[PDB]
Structure formats: structure tokens, C-alpha cells
Amino acid sequence: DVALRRFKRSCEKAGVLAEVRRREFYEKPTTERKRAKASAVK
Amino acid sequence: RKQVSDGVAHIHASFNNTIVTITDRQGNALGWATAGGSGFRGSRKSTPFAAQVAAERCADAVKEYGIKNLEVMVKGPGPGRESTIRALNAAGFRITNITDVTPIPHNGCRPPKKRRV
Amino acid sequence: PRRRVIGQRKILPDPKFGSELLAKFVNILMVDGKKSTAESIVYSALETLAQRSGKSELEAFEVALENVRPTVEVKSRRVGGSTYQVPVEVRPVRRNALAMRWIVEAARKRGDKSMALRLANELSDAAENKGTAVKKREDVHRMAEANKAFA
RNA sequence: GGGGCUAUAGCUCAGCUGGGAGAGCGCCUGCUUUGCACGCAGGAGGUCUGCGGUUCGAUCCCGCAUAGCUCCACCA
RNA sequence: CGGCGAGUAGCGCAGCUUGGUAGCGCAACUGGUUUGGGACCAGUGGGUCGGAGGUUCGAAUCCUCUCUCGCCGACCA
RNA sequence: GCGCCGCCAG
RNA sequence: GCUUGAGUCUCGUAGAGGGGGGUAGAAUUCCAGGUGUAGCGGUGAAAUGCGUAGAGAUCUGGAGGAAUACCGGUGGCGAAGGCGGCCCCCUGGACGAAGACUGACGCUCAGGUGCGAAAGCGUGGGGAGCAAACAGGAUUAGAUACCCUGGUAGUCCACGCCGUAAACGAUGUCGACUUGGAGGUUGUGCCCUUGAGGCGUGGCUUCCGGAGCUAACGCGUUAAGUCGACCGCCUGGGGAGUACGGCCGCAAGGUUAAAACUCAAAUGAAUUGACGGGGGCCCGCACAAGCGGUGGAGCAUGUGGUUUAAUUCGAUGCAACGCG
RNA sequence: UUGAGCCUUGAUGUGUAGGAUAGGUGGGAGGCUUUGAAGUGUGGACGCCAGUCUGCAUGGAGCCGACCUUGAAAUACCACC
Ligand SMILES: [K+]
Ligand SMILES: [K+]
Ligand SMILES: [K+]
Ligand SMILES: [K+]
Ligand SMILES: [K+]
Ligand SMILES: [K+]
Ligand SMILES: [Mg+2]
Ligand SMILES: [Mg+2]
Ligand SMILES: [Mg+2]
Ligand SMILES: [Mg+2]
Ligand SMILES: [Mg+2]
Ligand SMILES: [Mg+2]
Ligand SMILES: [Mg+2]
Ligand SMILES: [Mg+2]
Ligand SMILES: [Mg+2]
Ligand SMILES: [Mg+2]
Ligand SMILES: [Mg+2]
Ligand SMILES: [Mg+2]
Ligand SMILES: [Mg+2]
Numbered sequence: 046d047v048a049l050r051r052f053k054r055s056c057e058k059a060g061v062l063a064e065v066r067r068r069e070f071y072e073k074p075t076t077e078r079k080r081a082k083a084s085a086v087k
Numbered sequence: 088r089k090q091v092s093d094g095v096a097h098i099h100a101s102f103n104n105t106i107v108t109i110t111d112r113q114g115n116a117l118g119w120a121t122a123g124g125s126g127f128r129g130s131r132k133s134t135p136f137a138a139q140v141a142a143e144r145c146a147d148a149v150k151e152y153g154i155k156n157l158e159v160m161v162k163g164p165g166p167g168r169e170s171t172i173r174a175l176n177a178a179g180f181r182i183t184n185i186t187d188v189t190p191i192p193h194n195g196c197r198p199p200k201k202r203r204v
Numbered sequence: 205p206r207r208r209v210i211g212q213r214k215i216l217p218d219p220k221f222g223s224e225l226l227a228k229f230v231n232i233l234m235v236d237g238k239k240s241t242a243e244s245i246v247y248s249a250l251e252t253l254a255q256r257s258g259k260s261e262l263e264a265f266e267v268a269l270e271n272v273r274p275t276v277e278v279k280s281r282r283v284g285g286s287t288y289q290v291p292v293e294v295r296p297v298r299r300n301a302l303a304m305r306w307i308v309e310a311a312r313k314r315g316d317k318s319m320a321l322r323l324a325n326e327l328s329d330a331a332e333n334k335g336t337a338v339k340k341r342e343d344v345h346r347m348a349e350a351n352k353a354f355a
Numbered sequence: 356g357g358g359g360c361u362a363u364a365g366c367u368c369a370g371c372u373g374g375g376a377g378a379g380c381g382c383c384u385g386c387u388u389u390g391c392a393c394g395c396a397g398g399a400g401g402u403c404u405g406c407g408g409u410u411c412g413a414u415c416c417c418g419c420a421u422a423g424c425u426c427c428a429c430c431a
Numbered sequence: 432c433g434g435c436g437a438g439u440a441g442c443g444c445a446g447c448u449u450g451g452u453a454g455c456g457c458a459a460c461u462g463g464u465u466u467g468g469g470a471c472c473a474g475u476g477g478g479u480c481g482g483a484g485g486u487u488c489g490a491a492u493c494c495u496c497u498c499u500c501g502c503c504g505a506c507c508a
Numbered sequence: 509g510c511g512c513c514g515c516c517a518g
Numbered sequence: 519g520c521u522u523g524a525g526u527c528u529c530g531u532a533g534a535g536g537g538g539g540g541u542a543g544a545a546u547u548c549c550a551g552g553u554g555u556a557g558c559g560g561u562g563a564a565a566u567g568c569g570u571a572g573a574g575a576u577c578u579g580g581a582g583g584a585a586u587a588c589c590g591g592u593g594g595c596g597a598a599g600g601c602g603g604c605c606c607c608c609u610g611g612a613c614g615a616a617g618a619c620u621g622a623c624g625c626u627c628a629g630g631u632g633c634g635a636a637a638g639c640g641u642g643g644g645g646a647g648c649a650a651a652c653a654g655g656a657u658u659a660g661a662u663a664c665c666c667u668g669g670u671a672g673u674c675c676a677c678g679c680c681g682u683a684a685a686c687g688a689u690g691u692c693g694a695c696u697u698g699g700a701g702g703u704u705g706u707g708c709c710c711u712u713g714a715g716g717c718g719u720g721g722c723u724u725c726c727g728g729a730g731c732u733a734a735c736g737c738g739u740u741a742a743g744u745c746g747a748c749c750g751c752c753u754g755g756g757g758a759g760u761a762c763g764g765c766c767g768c769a770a771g772g773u774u775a776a777a778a779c780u781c782a783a784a785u786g787a788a789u790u791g792a793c794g795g796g797g798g799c800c801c802g803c804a805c806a807a808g809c810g811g812u813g814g815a816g817c818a819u820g821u822g823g824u825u826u827a828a829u830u831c832g833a834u835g836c837a838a839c840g841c842g
Numbered sequence: 843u844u845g846a847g848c849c850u851u852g853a854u855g856u857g858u859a860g861g862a863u864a865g866g867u868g869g870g871a872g873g874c875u876u877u878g879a880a881g882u883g884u885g886g887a888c889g890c891c892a893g894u895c896u897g898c899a900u901g902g903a904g905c906c907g908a909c910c911u912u913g914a915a916a917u918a919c920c921a922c923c
């Protein structure tokens with residue numbers, strides 16, 4: 046019972062279930078994809 | 088009763104509830120328990136403890152079948168993906184495999200609308 | 205408190221027996237700073253408890269405490285705008301603090317003659333269970349067992 | 356009519372069991388919370404009416420008494 | 432003209448059948464909560480039952496007459 | 509989980 | 519005449535550019551069975567709903583529609599709108615490389631014409647999932663909402679119509695010129711290519727920033743800098759992108775577009791505060807942990823009110839009410 | 843396959859006392875009895891795990907009775923359920 050199933054983190058299984066719970070309107074993903082990578086900055 | 092010494096525990100871990108169904112390898116159910124049916128309701132129902140207790144109550148009610156080795160199969164994001172597998176091991180089964188079978192569409196059907204809470 | 209998180213201080217031992225545990229018990233029982241009145245009640249009640257159940261004076265007292273001391277109790281956390289009654293392990297100092305408070309609280313509710321009798325009976329009750337203080341403990345445990353989900 | 360059936364906390368409903376009155380919602384405290392709900396833990400609250408049968412029968416043989424229940428109804 | 436129904440607290444309504452004891456919601460009142468109002472909480476209070484007569488030991492309740500207000504009918508010519 | 513409002517001029 | 523603008527040809531390159539057809543895997547739903555048994559589902563909590571007529575769970579088989587996880591990227595392509603599995607067919611543009619060719623053939627563009635997200639409309643299909651309307655359940659003072667359970671248009675396809683969006687870079691098109699830095703992407707040349715090197719040269723693109731500009735914010739070789747060509751448009755707020763008329767449209771409406779009347783403002787950017795059911799960090803008997811009270815009783819005392827000939831005047835959230 | 847009846851032959855019964863998981867009674871003094879027993883190995887059987895019921899083996903002729911404890915007393919066999 047070591048239960049190191051961090052493969053689920055690797056496959057982003059829980060990630061993909063959370064994002065699929067509700068519909069994101071195309072506009073909303075675009076805005077967060079732009080805000081994600083503006084934040085990805087030194 | 089039946090000669091089932093090695094089955095599979097199917098864990099349906101939703102956000103609201105956990106259903107544990109033990110089955111033979113062919114997929115015929117032997118017994119089941121739920122967090123909802125184990126004297127846990129509402130806020131308590133959606134906890135890793137209520138799932139543990141359910142997995143305990145499901146280990147019991149397949150005593151007669153005489154199972155020893157089980158593969159685990161975990162659907163869903165919910166609390167009690169892991170407290171359920173621990174409980175199965177602690178109930179004296181030999182955990183063999185742990186697959187995850189949460190279905191992901193490869194795009195597919197439009198989900199319901201976002202909640203405005 | 206927010207900043208300096210210090211409390212409590214030195215106490216004298218019980219005059220008769222030399223027990224800080226028993227000296228605290230007097231303080232729980234005391235009212236209006238009448239410590240002479242309180243320690244008279246305790247000694248009377250212990251004397252009766254000693255001859256009634258056998259044992260020593262403090263040995264009889266500790267046995268009562270053993271059966272009222274709570275192991276866990278519910279708190280309140282507030283995680284995300286939602287109050288969960290989380291069970292938490294009560295520390296040894298608070299353990300016997302609640303024990304002593306519940307015994308005294310029970311004894312003051314009983315309808316006997318003197319406080320010394322009221323107390324003596326409640327100490328005897330606690331040592332055998334069936335009392336109001338042990339019901340408090342049991343109730344506190346049931347509360348904590350019901351909310352074992354929230355740990 | 357003649358039969359067969361259920362008739363238990365204030366409401367609700369199980370109690371195959373001849374070894375016994377149980378759950379949830381009301382109502383009473385306590386914890387709970389900024390209060391308010393929500394949730395949680397205790398606490399009371401009596402089993403148609405009579406016999407037979409006895410080793411005890413909310414629980415059964417028998418006979419009455421109740422509303423409910425269907426069948427006969429050229430009930431002349 | 433004939434028929435049916437109604438009249439109960441400020442308002443809207445149970446109760447009447449089957450005589451003994453008048454309820455319910457809102458409003459009103461006092462207190463609490465608020466900086467204050469609303470909401471909310473806790474406490475109260477307020478009717479002799481349209482009028483009159485009768486039966487009854489006793490009538491909101493049963494009987495009769497009456498007033499007021501509704502509703503229905505008034506067809507064949 | 510629930511959180512409405514604040515008379516006119518100055 | 520000329521070749522430097524513009525164009526043609528040759529060879530390659532990258533690309534969710536477009537149209538048509540096909541196909542794959544995952545998942546949802548439904549249907550038929552097997553196993554199995556009392557719950558499922560849902561929420562803040564519930565309930566409506568589903569379930570012993572056997573649900574949910576689990577396994578098998580089948581049907582059908584829609585969308586293509588990962589790759590995936592301030593990545594790419596397109597005039598804009600937009601375009602994302604894989605395969606084929608038809609097809610548009612862009613860029614590079616040297617070289618040949620034509621010889622100003624250019625730029626802009628009122629009117630005009632075409633394309634033009636979503637919703638919507640017409641006819642005919644289709645319909646899994648989602649979901650205006652609608653229904654029920656909650657919540658609430660109410661709740662025609664937000665939340666829940668359902669759910670019809672529609673979303674999908676064909677053909678037609680509509681012609682609008684914060685259709686945005688709120689920035690018209692074309693050309694020239696003017697310090698830099700770090701990237702992305704896509705070509706190409708040269709050099710020990712001597713290993714996911716080094717030095718050049720093109721195209722497109724992200725971020726930073728210099729001069730300059732700007733009300734400021736900011737923009738900054740992809741300019742909002744410095745100039746030139748042409749077009750579109752503005753002239754205080756409201757009334758109003760409304761009415762009337764015209765044109766367009768099946769309709770919804772679009773488009774063009776006033777006036778009276780009314781106000782002394784309306785407005786942009788930035789500043790200091792204050793505020794937030796914004797974020798971070800702290801504190802105080804603020805809370806928590808405790809102990810004892812007040813609110814009930816009688817009485818004392820102050821106040822409100824009422825009363826009175828007069829009950830003198832003042833103090834009135836906290837910070838008036840055993841107060842002057 | 844699957845019930846329903848019936849026949850025949852097996853198994854089955856948890857007040858509290860407690861040899862102790864007791865349906866009513868007698869022809870009622872023993873029989874299943876080397877178509878073999880004491881004691882043990884195994885399996886089936888249910889469970890309120892106290893325990894009982896026995897098949898197959900082994901060991902190879904002994905377990906057993908009615909007493910005393912209980913509402914209810916033999917289940918020492920058998921017979922009517
Ligand atoms: K006629
Ligand atoms: K192409
Ligand atoms: K839906
Ligand atoms: K539909
Ligand atoms: K400035
Ligand atoms: K004007
Ligand atoms: Mg034009
Ligand atoms: Mg459309
Ligand atoms: Mg259409
Ligand atoms: Mg259509
Ligand atoms: Mg909805
Ligand atoms: Mg426009
Ligand atoms: Mg756009
Ligand atoms: Mg514009
Ligand atoms: Mg042009
Ligand atoms: Mg810049
Ligand atoms: Mg118009
Ligand atoms: Mg017009
Ligand atoms: Mg406090």
C-alpha cells in the first residue's frame with residue numbers, strides 16, 4: 046500500500062475531468078490562454 | 088457459494104458520492120456499498136471517510152464468495168479515490184493492479200453550462 | 205490571544221494531600237474567592253468517597269476522573285464559508301480541566317443536602333458511571349464520532 | 356350479504372419470529388453559527404376491544420367490535 | 432317575479448353538517464436586533480359570530496322572520 | 509446558503 | 519526611352535487558407551440482455567426527479583448524432599468574418615532562391631459590387647449532447663432570477679435569406695524615412711557539418727524600450743515618430759441613430775437620417791483620499807477559551823412619555839439616560 | 843430450464859435454570875448393535891461459535907440410561923406428528 050499513483054498527475058487525469066465539468070465558451074479559453082502566457086514571464 | 092477467489096473492485100468516485108462494486112473478472116457484481124448508504128448524508132457523504140466506510144461495508148458482503156486478490160479500477164475525481172483503495176487493502180485483500188478508468192472524451196459532447204454561484 | 209500566547213502560573217499543593225491536581229479541583233469548586241469554604245467541601249466529600257468505595261483519598265478521586273476525562277471533542281473550522289464540527293484531540297491539561305468542570309457542574313445540579321454529599325455522590329457515580337458527568341463525556345464522544353468524517 | 360384482510364409514538368410506518376414496540380419528520384434541551392437557517396448529539400412520547408392458550412403471545416386458534424376491500428345482488 | 436348562496440377580529444378566510452370550548456394568515460401592539468428603516472426574532476392583545484324571534488338547562492351552530500350583498504332562472508308564444 | 513434601503517436644500 | 523515601382527516565368531518551402539467526398543478512436547445518450555440490491559442523483563443544505571414494476575453500479579451486444587483529448591505554442595494560415603483528428607480529390611494565396619522577361623502596366627477609391635461571427639427567418643432533412651421559452655423544486659420579504667430536476671425552438675446538414683457584433687489593435691489603405699535589446703516561426707547563403715555549431719541575408723510575428731510624439735495613459739521601424747497620395751468620418755450632453763420619407767428585407771429589422779424641446783454641462787486621462795460581500799500583512803477582552811452578570815422579581819435612581827397650575831433648564835446612537 | 847402438489851427417504855428445532863441450540867406421549871428397561879466401538883484425522887452442515895449433526899477414513903468392539911440440576915425430562919431405542 047505505497048499508493049504512489051502519481052501517474053494520475055502525469056496523465057493530468059484529474060485536471061482533464063475538472064476542465065470538462067462545464068462548457069467553456071471559445072472566448073473564455075482564448076482569454077485564459079492569453080492571460081496564462083502573459084503571466085508566464087520574468 | 089461461488090468459486091470467486093480473485094475479483095475486481097470498481098470505485099465510482101463522484102464529487103457527491105462513492106459507489107464501491109466488487110465483481111468477478113467477467114464483470115458480474117458480487118456485492119456493493121455506497122458512502123450514501125453507510126449512514127452518511129449531505130456534506131458527510133462526500134468525504135474520504137464515508138468512502139472508506141463504504142469500502143469496509145463492501146468488503147463485508149463479499150465474505151461468502153471468498154475473494155483474496157482484487158484489481159482496483161477507479162473512476163471519477165471525487166474524494167475517496169484513495170481512501171477506498173486503502174480500506175480494501177486494510178480489509179485484508181491483496182491489491183494486484185490499480186488502473187484508472189475515468190472516461191475522457193477526445194473532444195466529444197458539449198458539457199453543461201458553467202454554474203453562476 | 206494574538207501576540208503573547210502565555211497563560212497559567214504556579215499553584216500551591218493541596219494542604220492535606222499535596223496534590224496540584226486536587227488543588228485545581230478546589231479552585232473549580234470555589235466561588236466568590238471563598239477557598240476555605242471550598243476545600244472544606246472537597247475534603248468532606250473525599251472522606252466520604254474514601255470510606256464508601258475503599259481505596260485511598262486521591263486514588264478514589266483519580267478513578268472518578270478517569271471515567272469523565274474526554275479523549276476528543278468537536279471544534280469549528282470554517283474552511284470555505286462552511287462550518288464543519290471537526291473532532292480534535294483534547295490535550296492532557298484540558299483533559300482533566302473538563303473532567304473537573306463537569307463533575308462540579310453535575311454535583312451542583314444534584315438535589316441532595318450538602319454540597320459535600322452532592323459531590324461525594326457524583327464522585328461515586330463517576331467512578332461507577334451512570335452519573336450526569338459521564339453522560340457529558342459520552343455525549344461529547346458521540347458528537348465527535350458523528351463528525352469523524354471531518355478529520 | 357357470506358368470505359378474506361390490514362387497523363402500532365401526536366403524525367407516519369416496519370416489526371414472518373410465541374422470549375420486544377422500532378426508524379424519519381414535528382415538539383423539548385445542548386453543541387452549532389455575525390446571527391438566522393443548515394447540520395450534529397441526547398431526551399421524553401404507547402401497541403382496536405374481549406376470551407381461549409399458557410413457557411411470554413404489537414405477535415396465534417376462537418368469538419365479537421371498527422372503518423377500509425372485492426366478490427355474489429332478478430337479493431323480493 | 433321566482434330560486435339558491437353568503438353575512439364570523441381592521442382585511443381575507445376555517446368553524447355550522449353532527450349544540451358545551453370561537454380559530455387561522457395578514458395587519459395592530461410591546462420588547463429585541465440595526466447608526467436607522469425594512470426584514471427577522473421573542474412576547475402579548477383584540478371578536479359573541481348582520482338584526483329580531485323561537486326550541487333548548489345551554490345557540491356562531493338547529494328552526495322562523497327580516498335586512499344587506501352576490502349568483503342563477505324568467506321559456507312556448 | 510441568505511446581506512434590500514438611506515427624503516429636499518446646504 | 520529606361521528599370522529602381524508594379525507584374526509574368528522557372529525551382530522549392532511551410533501552412534487549422536477554401537470547396538467536395540471518405541474514414542477512425544474516445545465519450546455521452548438510448549435500446550436489448552447478463553450479474554446484482556437499496557438506494558441513486560442532486561445541493562450550501564434540500565427537494566422536485568429516478569429506483570424493489572429492480573434503479574444507480576458493473577459486463578456484453580447494438581443504434582444514432584455531434585465534436586475531434588494529447589500534439590497545442592502571445593504557434594500557423596486567411597482581406598476580414600474565420601479556419602484544428604486522419605485520408606483522398608478539386609482549388610486560392612504567401613514566402614525564398616538565383617536568373618530571364620514586360621516596361622510605370624501604379625496608388626487610392628464616392629457611387630457600385632462581393633464576402634461577412636452569433637442569433638434569427640424560409641423549405642426540406644437530422645437530432646446524441648447542450649439549451650432560450652416553458653414546467654416543477656428550492657432560495658427569498660418577494661424571486662417572473664441566480665442554484666436544482668426536467669426540457670422545446672435552436673445548436674447539426676442542404677439550399678436560400680438576413681447584413682449586424684466591444685465585426686476591436688476601439689488604431690483606413692499604399693509608399694518612403696528614422697537609435698536598440700531579447701524571443702517565436704518560416705526560408706535561404708557561406709564557413710573544420712567536424713555533436714539538438716559559428717557568421718550572414720529574407721518573410722511573418724511576441725515582448726521590452728530610445729529619440730520623437732501624446733492631455734495623460736501610453737505608442738515607439740508591425741508608430742500613436744518624421745513625411746507624401748487618396749478615401750471614410752467628427753463638430754457640447756440629451757432628445758436620437760429616434761421620427762417622417764426613401765431604398766432593402768418573408769419577417770425580425772437594416773440602411774440613409776432630422777426637428778422642436780431641454781440642460782450648463784456631458785466627457786477623457788491622471789491625482790489625493792474614502793470605500794469594497796478585492797488581495798496581503800498586523801493589532802485590541804474584537805472573537806475564541808473561561809468566570810460572573812444584565813434582560814424576569816421587588817426596590818433605588820436617571821430618562822422617554824403621559825399628567826399637571828407648574829411638573830424649571832440642559833445632556834439624546836457608540837461618545838445622553840446613578841449625565842450637569 | 844423452472845416452479846406447484848403429492849409419495850418415499852433423509853436432515854431441522856437457540857425463555858432462564860443449564861450433563862445442555864428441550865415438538866407432544868406411550869407398546870414404555872435398553873438397543874443402531876463384529877451391514878464392528880473406544881478415542882482421534884478430514885469433509886459436509888447451519889449459527890444468537892455456544893455447539894451439534896454426522897458421511898468418508900483411521901483406530902479396530904465399546905460408546906452408553908434412565909440419576910442431581912428445569913415451565914418442559916429422555917432423543918436408552920422405537921411409534922404418532
Ligand atoms: K321548443
Ligand atoms: K494548399
Ligand atoms: K438540461
Ligand atoms: K431539443
Ligand atoms: K503623468
Ligand atoms: K442642443
Ligand atoms: Mg464605398
Ligand atoms: Mg447560425
Ligand atoms: Mg432553420
Ligand atoms: Mg430545419
Ligand atoms: Mg437549467
Ligand atoms: Mg455598426
Ligand atoms: Mg472578432
Ligand atoms: Mg469601429
Ligand atoms: Mg483596395
Ligand atoms: Mg514599447
Ligand atoms: Mg432606425
Ligand atoms: Mg427608414
Ligand atoms: Mg466570548
Ligand SMILES: [Mg+2]
Pocket residue numbers: none
Ligand atoms: Mg430588571
Ligand SMILES: [Mg+2]
Pocket residue numbers: none
Ligand atoms: Mg426634564
Ligand SMILES: [Mg+2]
Pocket residue numbers: none
Ligand atoms: Mg443642545
Ligand SMILES: [Mg+2]
Pocket residue numbers: 837
Ligand atoms: Mg456624545
